[PDB]
C-alpha cells in the first residue's frame, strides 16, 4: 500500500 501514510494511521 504505497498510498498509506504510517504517520496518519489512527490505529497507532
Amino acid at each position: 500500500n504505497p498510498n498509506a501514510n504510517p504517520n496518519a494511521n489512527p490505529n497507532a
Partner: antibody
Amino acid sequence: QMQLVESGGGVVQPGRSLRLSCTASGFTFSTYAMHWVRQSPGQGLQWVAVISYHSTNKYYEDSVRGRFTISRDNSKNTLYLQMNSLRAEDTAVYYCARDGYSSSFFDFWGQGTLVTVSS
Amino acid sequence: DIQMTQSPSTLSASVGDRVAITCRASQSISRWLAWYQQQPGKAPKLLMSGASVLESGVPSRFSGSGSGTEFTLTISSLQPDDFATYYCQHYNSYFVTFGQGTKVEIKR
C-alpha cells in the same frame, strides 16, 4: 523496478559476528516495516525480526533475541541485521522482506544471502 | 507459541488436477493466514493473505478458504508452474510462524 539487494553474507566462524545489508529501490523504503526471514538448507521458513518504519519498534524471535540486532537507515534505503555469537543453528539463507500491508506478512522478498557458520 | 501444521507434507498430482492443501493452527487466528509459493532456488512469493485475498498477478485458479483453526489452499486445475513447495503463515501477532511446507510433485 522494485528490488531488495542483500549482501554481507558468507562463511563466518562460530562465536563471531556479522552484519547483513539489504538495499531497497523502486519504492518508498521509509513508509514500510521491514522483516528478516531465514531458511536453513533443506528446511522451511522462519521469521527472525521486524523493525517499524521509523525504528521505534523492534521485535525478534525467541532463538535470536539478545544476539541479533535489527536496524535501518532510511536515508540510505538500507536494512541491517547485526548477528552476534553466531551458532551452527544460524546457517541459512537470510531474506529481507517488505511488510507492504503493515500486518506482519510479506508481499515482496529479496533473493536472499547465504550465511554459513563453520570453522 | 502458535504451531502451524500443514498436511500432506508431500502431494503427488498431474497437470489438470484439482489439488487441496490443508493448514491447521494450534490456536484460533481468525482469518490472519497467508500462503506462499517457493520454486527451487527462488525466494518465496506471496499468494494470499486474509486466508482468501489473492495478490495481483496470482492466477485465479488459486483460492483459499477457512477460518479460525483450519485453512485450505486449492488449485482448481494444476498447471506446470504450480509444482513447488507451499507454506502457510499466521499473522495473529508480531511473532509469526510458518507451516513446515507442502511439496507438490509430479505423479507418474
